[PDB]
Amino acid sequence: MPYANQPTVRITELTDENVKFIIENTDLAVANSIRRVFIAEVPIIAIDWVQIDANSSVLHDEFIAHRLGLIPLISDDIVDKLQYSRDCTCEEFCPECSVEFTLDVRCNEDQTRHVTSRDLISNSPRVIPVTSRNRDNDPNDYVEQDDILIVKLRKGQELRLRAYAKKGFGKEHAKWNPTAGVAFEYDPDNALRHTVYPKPEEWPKSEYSELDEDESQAPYDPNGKPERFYYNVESCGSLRPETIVLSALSGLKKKLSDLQTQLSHEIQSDVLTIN
Amino acid sequence: MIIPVRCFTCGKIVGNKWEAYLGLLQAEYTEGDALDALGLKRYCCRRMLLAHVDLIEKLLNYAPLEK
Amino acid sequence: YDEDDDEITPDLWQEACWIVISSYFDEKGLVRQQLDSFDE
Amino acid sequence: MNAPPAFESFLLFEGEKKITINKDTKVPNACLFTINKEDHTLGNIIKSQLLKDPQVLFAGYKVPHPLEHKIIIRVQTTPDYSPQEAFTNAITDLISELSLLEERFRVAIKDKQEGIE
Amino acid sequence: SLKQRLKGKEGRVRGNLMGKRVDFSARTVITPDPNLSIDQVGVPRSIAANMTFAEIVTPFNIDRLQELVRRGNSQYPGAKYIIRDNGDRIDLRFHPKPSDLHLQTGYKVERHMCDGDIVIFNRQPTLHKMSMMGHRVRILPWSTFRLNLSVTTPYNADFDGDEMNLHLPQSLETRAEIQELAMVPRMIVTPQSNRPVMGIVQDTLTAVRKFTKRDVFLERGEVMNLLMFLSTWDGKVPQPAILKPRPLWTGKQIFSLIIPGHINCIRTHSTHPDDEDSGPYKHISPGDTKVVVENGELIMGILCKKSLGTSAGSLVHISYLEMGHDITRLFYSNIQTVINNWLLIEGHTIGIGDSIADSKTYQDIQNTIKKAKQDVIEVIEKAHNNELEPTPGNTLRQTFENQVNRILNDARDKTGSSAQKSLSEYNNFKSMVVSGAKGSKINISQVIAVVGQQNVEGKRIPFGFKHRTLPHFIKDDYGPESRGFVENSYLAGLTPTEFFFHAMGGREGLIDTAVKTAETGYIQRRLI
Amino acid sequence: QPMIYICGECHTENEIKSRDPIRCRECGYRIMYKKRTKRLVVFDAR
Amino acid sequence: DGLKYSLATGNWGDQKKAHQARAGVSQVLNRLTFASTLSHLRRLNSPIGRDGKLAKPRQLHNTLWGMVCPAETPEGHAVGLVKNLALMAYISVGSQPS
Amino acid sequence: RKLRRQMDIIVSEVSMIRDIREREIRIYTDAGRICRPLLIVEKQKLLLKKRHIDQLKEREYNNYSWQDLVASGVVEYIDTLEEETVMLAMTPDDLQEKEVAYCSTYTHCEIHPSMILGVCASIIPFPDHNQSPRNTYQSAMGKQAMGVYITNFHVRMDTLAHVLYYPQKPLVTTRSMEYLRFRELPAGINSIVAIASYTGYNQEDSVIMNRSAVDRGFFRSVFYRSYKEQESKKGFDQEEVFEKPTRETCQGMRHAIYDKLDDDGLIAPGVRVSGDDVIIGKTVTLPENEDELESTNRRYTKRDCSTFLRTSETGIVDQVMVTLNQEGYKFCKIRVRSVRIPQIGDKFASRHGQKGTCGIQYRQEDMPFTCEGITPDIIINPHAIPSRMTIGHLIECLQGKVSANKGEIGDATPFNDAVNVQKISNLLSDYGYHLRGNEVLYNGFTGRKITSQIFIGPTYYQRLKHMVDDKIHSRARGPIQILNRQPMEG
Amino acid sequence: LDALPRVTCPNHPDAILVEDYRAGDMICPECGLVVGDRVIDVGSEWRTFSNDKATKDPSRVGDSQNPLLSDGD
Amino acid sequence: FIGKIPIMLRSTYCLLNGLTDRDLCELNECPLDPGGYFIINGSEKVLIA
């Protein structure tokens, strides 16, 4: 169709945690929705079912189940092999739609013990562990790299439980977030006056507004439109940044394609004023 | 009681950074800088870790080497 | 130690005063009114 | 708890139907599309793609109330070009434009970084 | 005793026969919901499933009702009970095969409420007849009664956690009677004082004046979005006020669609603006501030409480007399929806910024305060010399007390007038005051300029101690601060005396509020 | 089947499986606790 | 039992010599939040007719400065008849005049 | 006066006043006078000197204390009758200024002015930028903000208790709070708040909330209710017993299931209960035989009086305790834990008494975001500010913003020379924000910027005991009062 | 109708009759059957009040007097 | 022996007063509790001034 632009991309910065980039010649609605997809629609694996055998910590039961849910899971393995629990032929759970986790600890020593993700192990083969100390000793040491203190225990206290991680997404529960956050900005010089500054001199110029190193502050243009969106997605650690964005784009592509197939199905029978 | 995994506001995991913060303040007095070295660049995360209170320790303190 | 003779700078930054105020609560209860009466 | 199960926010029911199309009566060659179990995420972008097309006279969407996931899209085109075809083209073109973005992104990612893995 | 049981409150007549507790009732917290009509109310599924309404089976609705019996009780849109013409009532949970319980014409079926049954909704204490009105239920998730925001006004509800009571009528005769008489659309203009008992309020009220300003222009894309919310749209998009360089619709223009193309209000315009009594007539630059409606189109001027609000001569009132309650009904819902959504792109806020002013203003105000304080010393110096000369209708003490009060009031008013003027157009605070949404000129005076002379029982702070108000002052000090003037403003903090003196005057407001509810409750009762 | 009855502050079981007095032998305390069931309970992490 | 009774119920006297003159002098300690407990232990009460006596013993008299909290009363019914000490406040336990 | 300050006359218990216009001197040594500590100023200077302050700091290993300080006679206790006669000075500053001021006769001096405030008025920040009735309203709501209320709450069985998961100490504090142990045991959360109109679900004293935040645990709390039940001989031919009630023997037959109970007669920790389940099975063997002649069959020997759950939809049994009470009888307490997640209808308040209901909640997707992407946890409607004039709400907020960036806890002391408006705004700009708090906000539904900048920043908020599920209620037929034949109370 | 302490089920002889406390009705397990002369422990009705002023209990209509230690009351 | 007098918590005759933070923590009674309230029949009962 004659009206589709030529959506270009440029990558500025990439690290273990950040991806900083500019998308150009595209619509604002594409920009906002692709951002909405990065939070809500990107699938991931997270703990979702917890059963507690014995819990003697100084913290109550659901409190533990909650903390376990929120720990991020290294889903470097294509979560597409793991189908949604709703769809799978199995009763309740199975290896093909679940990962299984197990935790058993007790404080036998007189000193206080910490419970962390290293003690929590995947019964499932080592390809889908917790985020702490797996692919790397990592030269940037996080002193203990404990991921999270799940709880604390003393002499005589013990904690034995099971957990079942599953695929789900962000618009269901916050635990299924592939993002720690996402920055998003467009037209940093306010050329379009989509925001209207009283006393424009008291505003601090943004990291991209430097193109006009000029202290003149916002040159106007009345025939402008949105163009050149600036993103900076940062991972929570559960998935490498570029892989989140690529999965988001494709998943959204599956989502529209589904709307087309439903729409075609509607006109498969009666024409319903198709022309 | 006990740090919330991930900051309420944004999502950034913030239990991974707790004990390191307490350790660093015990070693080095520059709490603004201590938060920066830890990597919590942004103030929602900074209130999270900054204004948290470790109440768990009074609870561990009780006689309860029994329950 | 105080002497009221060699002293030349009796002023002091009343932001110091919380040290006086703390010594009040640190000594007194926060709720002595109750306790002293029952002890009496 | 009175609150719904959280999945109810997007999951279609066994009795409900994913899209329904009903014609307007107020003005000629106009149509109204209802999508069930959806959000601003689909609605907002498709509304914009239809506005981009110069043969669309009117196009818009709203969600009537936030607690009941449903969206409606009203579209009106010239009396020689059906609103159904425009809706089909706007989607297919959008999938294509996203795919171009997707292809161009991976290539951009490739170029110069040995830390893409 | 037997007499005592009969006596008064909680007595056999008044507390029991004349007012008994009833069955079929629901009560919960309220939250606002723009998305409802006016005469709708949202009801939690738990409350809707637990309560019941008795439909009687006819030949032409039997099949639907038989389906309802079949859904049982375990799922929401079901039935509780079935009653046989014989007189038998049957539960629909215990019986193992409801399908075996075939219905027939003459049975009554007590089904769960569904979207469209009519209820009496009520907030006690019920002050006037418009405090208890009929509504259509709307079943939705989470557990409060949700009701359109404009209905707050007759009810006095402030979703700060206020409760409501709901009552469900049972027969068709009480449903018809409520539907015809008690319904909210019928309640719009009040017989108490022949004015509209409910007007546009809070954000919608602020967002509309801001929207009707002739500086606002919308692109074709954003005009479509607003048109999309409107219910009674004709399907024809109106000719843009600007054809080129680029197509644009003015704020007033799109608003002309939301009013019923017939209402014909002139005047109602009285914002502060324009002028007081004759300035616009000084040759007539049309108006920029005076509203005009012709042929159901807003011609010029922005909207406020004076045009749009509960004032007896409004758009809502004239529309009600002219178009009739059902059209006024769709007009209320539509005005909020188009105006809330436009606000959604625009936004509205209030930071500390709206309360701070410029350096020159503070020097001018402080210089105003220094003049007033010097004048009070001047009155005191004149007073001690015994040369004040009493006013012809007071004693010497009363003249002094009148005179200082005149000056200190005069001082606050000058600095107050000075800050309202020193403020600009963008101050969101001015946008809330001017629309008539919340607050007042005196509120602006108090946050930024100066709080003024606190009061109790109609005079300055009393001498609680012997010839002093606080131990901090000198004896017999009749100046401003000592007798309870607050020199600073809530933006700049208060001094300890001012804080305590402010606290005395805030209390007089708490005692009045506590007592008033009792005596009015009693005086009202004697009259009816 | 026994009912355990974890003691006040020594937490040696009590096997209280009869109408006998709820006093824990050896330890003077006489307040109890019934212990968590061996019955499993499921928690969604949500 | 005579003391135990008085503290438990809230009544006054041994019941034979009335009880209405010192009703509600005893209460179950509220503990909703640490500030709540701490506030109830610092509560001060002020006797009245019981149902609508409007006069000066209800507002903020000037002598409260530094004794009783200026702004902290119930929001209804007893809207000034229930006072709280400030922070520095004290109450003399009494002593022999001898 | 010289003796009382010398300790020869009991200072705290003796007041001494001279009323010179009536030429009489009254002295009181009775109990029940309210008195406060004040500094003694002499020769128009403080009698307390810096040497004493260094002596007070020395107490970390010194035995020198407040009582020593009173014995130095630099402070006295002054009751309200005596407070009528003193010439009290507000601050040492004014006492210095006196060379130009009107008064040079001071006798006592205020140790600090915020001390005129009681406990609850002391938790609240910048109270003087509050319109005065707001301070009364908070002090009430402050008792209703739930928190962790003592630390040993795991072994207490308070009839009803409310504990928050993640309290936080107030990002902006009043100095006074260091002595309420409030830092040790907080009351609310440091939330990210925006004053915007948004989609107007928050008009009229309500709030729009971030659903992902309630999900990440934000303001999540636990609720415990404790049930107690007693067996009691209570008569010559009545017995109460804990047992598993059966329709074969007991008389009560309440359709509530008894299957969940243990053989003993009350359920064990960890079981799920609902609005029908029986927690404890007690029975009352009553007539025994006074129905003479084969009146046995079933449901005869004993009646049912066991305790169940009408109460609510409830949660999980936390603890069950069997012991014996003051009478000697076998006695039980069973605690039931529930986890309340903030939902439309619950009530919250900031420390200015900005109390309010939750109008709707939106997932992180919809909330309007900033440059970073900080989506608000709460949106309070701007209209709550102007008529109500809690400007302190905005000042707390702006100050809390500086604290979050600096990483240093701020200071909301109600009386200081910290020229709060200009000075804070200058600091906040230096950190790189708009100096007065606004931030350029974007719209969550369409990605477009919000045309007005939104005052956004952190503020301490409170969750209240008034949860919405507790107050909901309804009736259809139901119980009848046969002494009156009308429905029950509620 | 002097024989019904609870056997008043017209269609079929009864074995057990259940009390649906919340509905205020007497129901029969294996048909439909209400026959609601609703006793709701009628004993519960005086103990209905609580939130209104009490402690001293002005609304009390009877002292327990402990009868099971006394022939007369 | 003439009677039993109720003790107000942590006053000079309530045995908790002579103990330190660790000892009260060991007794399972919170160190940060203010005391000053009677305990009657399982309830903490506080007098109003």
Ligand SMILES: [Mg+2]
């Ligand atoms: Mg209200």
Ligand SMILES: [Zn+2]
């Ligand atoms: Zn499976």
Ligand SMILES: [Zn+2]
């Ligand atoms: Zn964060």
Ligand SMILES: [Zn+2]
């Ligand atoms: Zn033992």
Ligand SMILES: [Zn+2]
């Ligand atoms: Zn039957």
